[PDB]
Amino acid sequence: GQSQTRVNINAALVEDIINLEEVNEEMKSVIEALKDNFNKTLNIRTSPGSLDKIAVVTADGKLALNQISQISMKSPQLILVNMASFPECTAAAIKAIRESGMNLNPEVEGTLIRVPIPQVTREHREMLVKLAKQNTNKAKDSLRKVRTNSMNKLKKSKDTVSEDTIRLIEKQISQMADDTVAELDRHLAVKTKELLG
RNA sequence: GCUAAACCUAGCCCCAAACCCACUCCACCUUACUACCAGACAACCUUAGCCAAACCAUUUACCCAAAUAAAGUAUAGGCGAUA
RNA sequence: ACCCCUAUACCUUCUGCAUAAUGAAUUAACUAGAAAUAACUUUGCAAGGAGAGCCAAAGCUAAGACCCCCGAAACCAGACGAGCUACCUAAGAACAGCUAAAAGAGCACACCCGUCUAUGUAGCAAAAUAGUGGGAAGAUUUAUAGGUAGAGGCGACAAACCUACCGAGCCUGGUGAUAGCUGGUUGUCCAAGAUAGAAUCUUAGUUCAACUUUAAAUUUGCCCACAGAACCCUCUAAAUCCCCUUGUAAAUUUAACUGUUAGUCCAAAGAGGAACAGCUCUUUGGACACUAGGAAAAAACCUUGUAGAGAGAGUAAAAAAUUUAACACCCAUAGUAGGCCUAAAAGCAGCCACCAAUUAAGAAAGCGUUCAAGCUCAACACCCACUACCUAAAAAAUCCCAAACAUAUAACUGAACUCCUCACACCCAAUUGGACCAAUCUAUCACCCUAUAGAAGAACUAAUGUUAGUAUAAGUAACAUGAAAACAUUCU
RNA sequence: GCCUGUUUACCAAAAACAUCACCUCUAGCAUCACCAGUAUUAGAGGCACCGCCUGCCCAGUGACACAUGUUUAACGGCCGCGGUACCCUAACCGUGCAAAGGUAGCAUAAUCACUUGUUCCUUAAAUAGGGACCUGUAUGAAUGGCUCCACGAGGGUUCAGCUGUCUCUUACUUUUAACCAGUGAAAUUGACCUGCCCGUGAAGAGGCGGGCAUAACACAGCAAGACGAGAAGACCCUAUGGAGCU
RNA sequence: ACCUCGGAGCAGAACCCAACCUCCGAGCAGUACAUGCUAAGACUUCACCAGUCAAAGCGAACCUCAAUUGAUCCAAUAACUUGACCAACGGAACAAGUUACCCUAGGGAUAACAGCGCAAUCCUAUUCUAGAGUCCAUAUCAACAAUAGGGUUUACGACCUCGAUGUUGGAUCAGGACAUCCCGAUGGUGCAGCCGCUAUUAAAGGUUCGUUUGUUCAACGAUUAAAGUCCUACGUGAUCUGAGUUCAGACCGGAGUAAUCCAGGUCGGUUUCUAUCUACUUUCAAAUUCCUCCCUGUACGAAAGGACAAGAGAAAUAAGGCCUACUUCACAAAGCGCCUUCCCCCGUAAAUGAUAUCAUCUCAACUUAGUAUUAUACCCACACCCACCCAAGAACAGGGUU
Ligand SMILES: *O=P([O])([O])[C][P@@]([O])(OP([O])(=O)O[C][C]1O[C](N2[C]=NC3=C2N=C([N])[N]C3=O)[C]([O])[C]1[O])=O*
Ligand SMILES: [Mg+2]
Ligand SMILES: [Mg+2]
Ligand SMILES: [Mg+2]
Ligand SMILES: [Mg+2]
Ligand SMILES: [Mg+2]
Ligand SMILES: [Mg+2]
Ligand SMILES: [Mg+2]
Ligand SMILES: [Mg+2]
Ligand SMILES: [Mg+2]
Ligand SMILES: [Mg+2]
Ligand SMILES: [Mg+2]
Ligand SMILES: [Mg+2]
Ligand SMILES: [Mg+2]
Ligand SMILES: [Mg+2]
Ligand SMILES: [Mg+2]
Ligand SMILES: [Mg+2]
Ligand SMILES: [Mg+2]
Ligand SMILES: [Mg+2]
Ligand SMILES: [Mg+2]
Ligand SMILES: [Mg+2]
Ligand SMILES: [Mg+2]
Ligand SMILES: [Mg+2]
Ligand SMILES: [Mg+2]
Ligand SMILES: [Mg+2]
Ligand SMILES: [Mg+2]
Ligand SMILES: [Mg+2]
Ligand SMILES: [Mg+2]
Ligand SMILES: [Mg+2]
Ligand SMILES: [Mg+2]
Ligand SMILES: [Mg+2]
Ligand SMILES: [Mg+2]
Ligand SMILES: [Mg+2]
Ligand SMILES: [Mg+2]
Ligand SMILES: [Mg+2]
Ligand SMILES: [Mg+2]
Ligand SMILES: [Mg+2]
Ligand SMILES: [Mg+2]
Ligand SMILES: [Mg+2]
Ligand SMILES: [Mg+2]
Ligand SMILES: [Mg+2]
Ligand SMILES: [Mg+2]
Ligand SMILES: [Mg+2]
Ligand SMILES: [Mg+2]
Ligand SMILES: [Mg+2]
Ligand SMILES: [Mg+2]
Ligand SMILES: [Mg+2]
Ligand SMILES: [Mg+2]
Ligand SMILES: [Mg+2]
Ligand SMILES: [Mg+2]
Ligand SMILES: [Mg+2]
Ligand SMILES: [Mg+2]
Ligand SMILES: [Mg+2]
Ligand SMILES: [Mg+2]
Ligand SMILES: [Mg+2]
Ligand SMILES: [Mg+2]
Ligand SMILES: [Mg+2]
Ligand SMILES: [Mg+2]
Ligand SMILES: [Mg+2]
Ligand SMILES: [Mg+2]
Ligand SMILES: [Mg+2]
Ligand SMILES: [Mg+2]
Ligand SMILES: [Mg+2]
C-alpha cells in the first residue's frame, strides 16, 4: 500500500498564450465561495443572515430575498419578513422559501411573514448535511464548467504547437482539478463531521 | 556382415554440308475417331511492360539486306541516361 | 582406457557472441568472379609499327594478367476457367403430422442454415463430431442444361464470391524483371595492412578527399635551439607552429587500382543531462576489433610485442589494511526579600546597575519555584592517577562462501620479455602483393602413374541450398477381429 | 432494429444490408435488353411500415435556368461581447456579424472528456439496472426526431423454481490409460560423457571463476528451465520497395 | 523546430574541431563610372566546383562594408548581357492524402512488455537543535539543512532479444527477504487500570467471506488475534480463463471535400503442441490459535470503568490415519463422519569486582534467569519360488499358500 503523485510544469512557452495562474485563482475563488456558503448560511443557528438565497422567477427573472424587502430581529425563535404590501411578491417568496434545503415552516398572513424554527438534534442536522452535499455538488459543477472552459481554450490554442506540450498542460489541468475535488471533498467531510458531532 | 558401393552405353550438345516431310482398308469439325439431307456467319488492325536515368512524367539497343573499315564519326537526346 | 593439470564448438552479422543473436541430424553427388579504356612484364620491329582501315616529338604490334550465386511483393501481353461460388434464363421436383383465425402465421418431421458449449488441432475432416439451436407453403430448398471473366463478371455493400490460399483469379510468355536488403561465396604458405572530412531526395548507399597496397624516379623525411608567431579589458594553463645540430632512414614526386569511411572503453580539457547512467557530442593520448602473462571469471585496467624445437635460466606486472567514547573528591555563611518594573515577582519573567562583609562564594552559570523554598556550578579550606590520541559503524529477497594461519632470520614463485644449443619467410578485420599446387583434357614424353607446356564446367565443415540413402524422436503416437462350435450352425 | 429475410464458405449472423410506406431527380418513346412496355409508366437514388411531425437558410459548391434568378426529402449551415437588483439563471438593454442564427421533440444516451453528473427504487453491501433534472459548449428532425402493437439464436437488469457452478468434493461405467502379440508415423536434432549455490559475462550460464554434490541402468508421472518446437513478428522503424482507395 | 552565409564562446598562445549547445546578425545599402586591359607569385573553409590577395607592364587623373547569395541545361537578344524565396538555398523542368483490407526485403543499427545501468522522483535510517508538545529538543512529532542505505513507483539510456523473450488481471501451486499485521519476550512513556504511542529482538506458524468496476488500485457489508510490505521475467498461460487489452464487421459524437482517423464510448471476434535433456515425484515423526468459568467483579480509581499471573474446560485450523455408528454407498472406495498430535530460542533484568582500593551486570577475569539436542520413537531375517490369491500393485516390486 503506497500512493503516488506526479510532477509539475512551469515555463514561459506556456504563459505565451495560456496562464496557469488564472485557473488556480478561479479554483481558489470557488473554494472561498464554498467556504462562505458553509460559514454564512446555516451552521447551527438559523440566523437572519442565512436568508440570502435565490428567489423564483418574478417578472421574467430571478431576484434575491433580502434586496426586495428587509429582515429585522425580534425574538430568537421568530423571523419577521416585513415587506411593502405587494401581492405577488409574498407568494413568490413563500414558494421560493419552501423547498430550499432546511425546513423553514413559514406562516404567511398577508404582509407579516414569520419563520419560527426551534431546534432538532437529528433531522435538522441531516437536512443540513444534505444541503451541504448539494452545495458541494454545485461547487463541483462550477469546477467542471471552469475545466470545460479551460479545455476549450487549450483546444483553440493547440494547432500551432507540438502535441506533447498540449498533453502536459492537459495533465496539469487534470491534476489541479483533482486537487480541487479532493479539497472540496475534505471540506464536505469536515462539515459533515462537525454537524453530526 | 547386412544395408550397401563400383561399372559403360544407351543417348544427347555444338558445328559443317544439304532446303524437309506427310492416304495399306475404315473412321475423324455433331459429344472429333460418329456411313447417309435444305440458311448459305466467316481473316485482314501502332505491341505493351519489367528495366536505366540511382525516384519519375519525354526518353531506354532488340527492328531479320553476309564480313573488315570509315566509327562509336557526323547526328539525336529532361543536349542526360543513352541512342 | 578412466582417474591428474590446461581448455567458453564452427560460420555469418557486429564496437563487441560461449552467448540464451542466425545457419546446420548425418552421408554421397551437384552448386557461386563472365569483360573494357588506361597502366606492368615479356618477345618482335623501330622513326617507324601493323597481313589495306589505325597510331606515332620512342613509338607500334603480339601475349600474359581483372571485375559472383540464390531470394521478393510487383508491371504488361495472350490464352484458360460460372461442374465450387454471386446472379440470371429454360423446363422440372420436394415439403409427414397438429393447431388451420385469413396468413412471406404458430409447434414440429424430412430438408436448409449454423447461436452456444465440449472434443479435435499432422484430427474422421486443409473447417468435422456430439449436445444445444433458427427456418421448415416460401424473398424456401433442390436435381439438369445454358449465360455473364479479370482495366472485368456478379453482389438484399460482407471491398463478399469468381475451383481449397481475390484490395483484385490461374497458366504461359517479356523473365536469369529489379531490389542501396538478407544469406552464401569451395587448395597450401608468406608479407604489407585501422580510416581528419566534404557533397549528396543523403546518412542502411555513392563520389572526391584521408589511410592502406604494388611498381618506379629523385633527395631529403622525423626528433628538433638561440631567434620568432597583434591585441583589451580580470585571470589566461597543459601546451602548439617554425626550426640549424644530433640519433637516425625515411620522405617527396609518377602510374595503376581496389578496400576502410553504421566503431567501443580508459586517462585528461570540455559541452548537454541530475557536477545520473555500460547516457549523447568534440578535442589530446592509449587500448581493442592481433599473441601472451596478471587483476577470480573480464575488450577497453597493468606487464609484454616479430612468431620454431628444448624435460634449461634471469626477469616484468602480480596477495588491502583497519576495531574505536569511564571519570573527578569536598563546600556554599552574609548587606540583600540589590534597586526599577511588577497583584507577587527575592541570584535566576523584562531592563539599568553589577558595589561590597568575613581567611573563601559570582548582585549569579545551569535547572527548579505561582512568588518563596530546596538542587548544583563558579570560590576557599583539602589532598591532589590519568582528568581524555575530536568525530568519523545499517538492512532484500534460491544458499555464508576457497580452506586456513597473529611468533626459525628478505628471500622465493611468477610470461610467447630476455639469455642459452640449433634453425629461422612460418600469430591481425576488409584489401593488396608474392611462391606453390590435386583432379581433368590436349601437344610431346613417360609406361605400376609421371615430366615440360597450353586449356578450363579446374577444389565445399555452412546459402531454413537441390536430389538420393540412413539415423534421432521410436519400436513412440496411432490402427484392427461380437461369442461358442460339427466350422453345418446357434446366441447377443 | 418495425416485422419474414440477407451477409464476412474457413475466428465477426449483428444494432450491419434489404424490406412494404414516403420523397427527390431523369425520360414524349417502337422493334436484341429497358419492352414485344408508354408519365396511375420505366430507370437513377435517399430514408425506412404504421401514429404525431419533418423548423430557418441559396452566403459558398453542385445542378437547373442564362430575365443574377430557381433549387436543400441536393452537398451543407443554423452566432459573439458587455451592463444586467442581495444566488446559480435571468425578462430587458447596448453592440457587432451573418444566409439563418438549433424550432418542436428527446436527453448524461451506443452521443469526446470532466463522468462513480445529482436524486428516488432495487441488494446487508449496486462504477451494474429502472424512474425524474438539463452547461447536449460536440443532441436534434428523410445524416430523419419522438412515442407505440407484434417480433428478434441481437445487448443489459431481475422475482420464484434447483441444478456439483461452488462451499468441497466422492463413488461407478465406457473411451482413454499400463502390460502382452502384429503392423507401424509426424514436428524436432551443431556435437554432448547433458548436476546445485554464489559471482562474472553481449547485462537472465549444465559448459567461465570459487565451493558443494557424484557407482552404472531401466519404467510411470509433473511441467520450474533448455531465453522449448511449427510460422525469415502480424505491433514499431527504414527502403528515393509495392499495392488498394479518395 | 530546423535545412544557405557571417561574428563571439565551447576551441584560453600555428591551423582545424561536433551538438534538436549559448548569444547576435544577412538575403542589402552608399559613392565614383579607368567598378579599363593584360601579367610574376601565392592563399584557399579540410575533396571537387567555387572564392581571395597580387609585384611588374599598356593606358588615365595627378572603392566603404562581414554575411549581403545560386552551378549545368535551357530561354530572351544583332551584340554586350539578362533570367529563380531552384530558401529542401551544390539546385529532379513539371507529382498531395489515407490504408485497422494491406503486401515484400530487412532492423534489437530502432520503439512498445521484460531484463539490464543510473537514482532526477520515491522510501527508510542516523546528525544539529529551530519550533510544537502548559514549562520540558529527544513520551511523540519535526522547519532550514547534513551524512548514508534500498531499487516498490514515475522517467531517462537503447546494451542481448523482431528466422517471434506470448502482454493485464484472475485460478492452482507457492519459494524467499523483514523494513513485523497477529501469536512470543523486553526498554521508555505526557504508562493509575482497559485500550494506547515508540524502540529492540523474534520469520517456526497464520493472515476471511461477500456487492460494484475486467481490473491490479478503489468504495461498501459482515467478521477475525491479523485480514502486513516487497521480490520471484510487475512469480507461474508447453497447468487453465481471455473478462478487457494487440486486427478484419458495425453504430454514436467529432476531424477531414473524400478515402480515412480518435492514448473517445459500445456489440461481436479460432489460444497449436504425442515431453528429447536438466530438476522433481512420502523429509517416517518433536503443531498453532481463539473462546468460556474461577481469580472477580479482586489489583487500580474519586466514579465510570477495569487487568494481569496460576488453574480448569471446551473448541477452530493444519498434519498423519480409520470405517463402528451417520451420509454418497455397499463382500470397497470416501466425507459431511471419527481418533491422535510432545522442546527451546537471548533482547535484557540482577550479585561479587578491578583497570579507576567508592561505585560498575563483565567485547575484565566470573555467578544467575541460560538454553530444549549431544534426546527418543519408527525401519533394519542376505536367495523356496512353476503356479494361485491378496486389504500389495501402471509394469516391476511386496505379503500369504499348513
Ligand atoms: O449505594 P450504592 O450505589 O449501592 C454503593 P453500596 O450499595 O456498596 P455495596 O454495599 O453495594 O457494596 C458493593 C460491593 O461490595 C461488596 N462487599 C460488601 N461487604 C463486603 C464486600 N465484599 C467483600 N469481599 N467483603 C466484604 O466484607 C458487595 O459484595 C458488593 O458487591 O453501598
Ligand atoms: Mg528506374
Ligand atoms: Mg540500382
Ligand atoms: Mg568472451
Ligand atoms: Mg543479418
Ligand atoms: Mg548488435
Ligand atoms: Mg547459437
Ligand atoms: Mg537477424
Ligand atoms: Mg535451427
Ligand atoms: Mg452453375
Ligand atoms: Mg411459416
Ligand atoms: Mg418453426
Ligand atoms: Mg443474396
Ligand atoms: Mg461497409
Ligand atoms: Mg537479383
Ligand atoms: Mg603481418
Ligand atoms: Mg540505404
Ligand atoms: Mg558509449
Ligand atoms: Mg536556593
Ligand atoms: Mg619461467
Ligand atoms: Mg622475441
Ligand atoms: Mg558449373
Ligand atoms: Mg565449380
Ligand atoms: Mg561434399
Ligand atoms: Mg525450420
Ligand atoms: Mg548444405
Ligand atoms: Mg506394442
Ligand atoms: Mg516418448
Ligand atoms: Mg496407445
Ligand atoms: Mg470391432
Ligand atoms: Mg432485423
Ligand atoms: Mg465466418
Ligand atoms: Mg452463407
Ligand atoms: Mg459465427
Ligand atoms: Mg438498415
Ligand atoms: Mg429539414
Ligand atoms: Mg460522454
Ligand atoms: Mg451483477
Ligand atoms: Mg430474423
Ligand atoms: Mg548467473
Ligand atoms: Mg545451451
Ligand atoms: Mg519458442
Ligand atoms: Mg525478418
Ligand atoms: Mg533515401
Ligand atoms: Mg517507389
Ligand atoms: Mg516502380
Ligand atoms: Mg493496377
Ligand atoms: Mg584546398
Ligand atoms: Mg600596377
Ligand atoms: Mg534536396
Ligand atoms: Mg543541401
Ligand atoms: Mg473497422
Ligand atoms: Mg472496410
Ligand atoms: Mg515482414
Ligand atoms: Mg540495441
Ligand atoms: Mg525498459
Ligand atoms: Mg516552546
Ligand atoms: Mg549509441
Ligand atoms: Mg523482438
Ligand atoms: Mg529460433
Ligand atoms: Mg526486526
Ligand atoms: Mg506477470
Ligand atoms: Mg512457462
Ligand SMILES: [Mg+2]
Ligand atoms: Mg455471438
Ligand SMILES: [Mg+2]
Ligand atoms: Mg495452451
Ligand SMILES: [Mg+2]
Ligand atoms: Mg539438456
Ligand SMILES: [Mg+2]
Ligand atoms: Mg462496577
